[PDB]
Paper text:
Inositol polyphosphate 1-phosphatase (INPP1) is a prototype member of metal-dependent/lithium-inhibited phosphomonoesterase protein family defined by a conserved three-dimensional core structure. Enzymes within this family function in distinct pathways including inositide signaling, gluconeogenesis, and sulfur assimilation. INPP1 catalyzes the metal-dependent hydrolysis of the phosphomonoester bond from the 1 position phosphate of Ins(1,4)P2 or Ins(1,3,4)P3 to yield inositol 4-phosphate and inositol 3,4-bisphosphate, respectively. Conserved secondary structural elements comprise juxtaposed metal binding pockets and define a shared sequence pattern of D54…E79E80…D153PID156S157T158…D317 as shown for INPP1.
We therefore tested the effect lithium addition in the presence of substrate. INPP1 was co-crystallized in the presence of 10X molar excess of Ins(1,3,4)P3 and 2 mM Gd3+, but also 200 mM Li+. In the presence of substrate, no electron density peak was observed for Gd3+ at metal site GD3 with little change in density observed at metal site GD1. A 15.4σ difference density peak was found for metal site GD1, with no detectable peak for metal site GD3 indicating lithium displaces metal at site GD3 and that binding requires the presence of substrate. Interestingly, a 4.9σ difference density peak was found for gadolinium binding at GD2, the equivalent of MG2, indicating poorly ordered Gd3+ in that site. This provides further evidence Li+ does not displace metals at either sites GD1 or GD2. In dramatic contrast, co-crystallization of INPP1 with Gd3+, I(1,3,4)P3 and Li+ resulted in a stunning complete loss of electron density at metal site GD3 (no observable density even at below 1 sigma) with little change in density at site GD1 (remained above 20 sigma). Because we did not observe significant changes in the side-chain geometry for residues that coordinate the metal binding sites, we infer the parsimonious explanation is lithium replaces gadolinium at metal site 3. A partially ordered Gd3+ was found in metal site GD2 in the substrate-bound, lithium-treated structure and importantly excludes this metal site as the lithium-binding site. In the Gd3+/Ins(1,3,4)P3 and Gd3+/Li+/Ins(1,3,4)P3 structures, the ion could either be a phosphate from the Ins(1,3,4)P3 substrate molecule or a sulfate from the Gd2(SO4)3 in the crystallization solutions.
Numbering used by the authors: 1 to 31, 46 to 237, 263 to 274, 284 to 340, 349 to 358, 366 to 389
The structure:
């Protein structure tokens, strides 16, 4: 599914463009009217539509944390369907934004904008996966709170950002419908490095593939350590915002373990990161099951919450080392 994965890298950067666009443009920045739900519902639809456009029959296999439905200020329930032309999308968004024409024409231009983001490494890869066995968990913009606050001035504690826009991630995971094993995953940090003078944000994309014993993943920059959420309350540890980011810390090797005790993460939070951690010999396990190892499945519903928490590990040896102490 390299051709599918290659296409998922594009829409992830297209999703990042929308995420960056809303914050960086005054009309969309200044924004009853729940903008974030709109920003989420829009990004997940753009991914859903673009993949159905390039691979017919994937549209109905793409699941996410948002619906394709928004309730405007009047109480009118609008089915978020974009295109086919740019004009149609402006008429749709104006029905949501009470007839804000400047904001509607702003989003539409970024949504229909072409992006040609292509890894030369993955062009060399020719892997075929049957499309009939694929299911996709999308998280449009993970760390919704941090995205809205928009802190560009946070100093990281030993490589790990406790808060800020660095914690915001676009998560796209692909899994096996029958076995429930994660196969492919894309993570896009829209906000990584901001130039102080031009105020522009540069992002960073990561991916991984684990299909029938073939394991490949994006080139990782160089340079136990445990990461937990800011609301964590169970017994060298770091606080860090965002589910997807804390998972990316394990992938980058900034942290050795990421443990979450509560049941308030779902399939769309973990799936993307899992597939990548799988491609590096690691993975994710049910915490409560380990305390009494098994991997997380993404095909059956408990509904779609990872009940009994999780542990995200890079090395199964480091997992045993950590599980020994506790
Ligand atoms: Gd989200
Ligand atoms: Gd999330």
């Amino acid at each position: 599914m390299s051709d599918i994965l290659q296409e998922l890298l594009r829409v992830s950067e297209k999703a990042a463009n929308i995420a960056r666009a809303c914050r960086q443009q005054e009309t969309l920045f200044q924004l009853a009217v729940d903008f974030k739900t709109l920003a989420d519902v829009l990004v997940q639809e753009v991914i859903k539509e673009n993949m159905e456009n390039k691979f017919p029959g994937l549209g109905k296999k793409i699941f996410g944390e948002e619906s394709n439905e928004l309730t405007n200020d009047l109480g009118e329930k609008i089915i978020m369907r974009l295109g086919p032309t740019e004009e149609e999308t402006v008429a749709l968004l104006s029905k949501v934004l009470n007839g804000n024409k400047l904001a509607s024409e702003a989003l539409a231009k970024v949504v229909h904008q072409d992006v040609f983001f292509s890894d030369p490494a993955l062009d060399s890869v020719e892997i075929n996966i049957p499309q009939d066995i694929l299911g996709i968990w999308v998280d449009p913009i993970d760390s919704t709170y941090q995205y809205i606050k928009g802190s560009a001035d946070i100093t990281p504690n030993q490589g790990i950002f406790p808060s800020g826009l660095q914690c915001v991630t676009v998560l796209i995971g692909v899994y096996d419908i029958q076995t429930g094993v994660p196969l492919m995953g894309v993570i896009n940090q829209p906000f990584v490095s901001q130039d102080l003078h031009t105020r522009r944000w540069k992002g960073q994309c990561y991916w991984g593939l684990s299909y029938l014993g073939t394991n490949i993943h994006s080139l990782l920059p160089p340079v136990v350590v445990i990461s937990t959420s800011e609301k964590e309350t169970i017994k060298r540890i770091f606080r860090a915002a965002g589910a997807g980011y804390k998972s990316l810390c394990v992938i980058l090797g900034l942290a050795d373990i990421y443990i979450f005790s509560e049941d308030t993460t779902f399939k769309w939070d973990s799936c993307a990161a899992h597939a990548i951690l799988r491609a590096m010999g690691g993975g994710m396990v049910d915490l409560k099951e380990c305390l009494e190892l098994p991997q997380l499945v993404y095909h059956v519903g408990n509904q779609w919450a990872n009940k009994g928490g999780l542990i995200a590990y890079r090395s199964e040896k480091q997992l045993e080392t950590f599980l020994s102490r506790l």
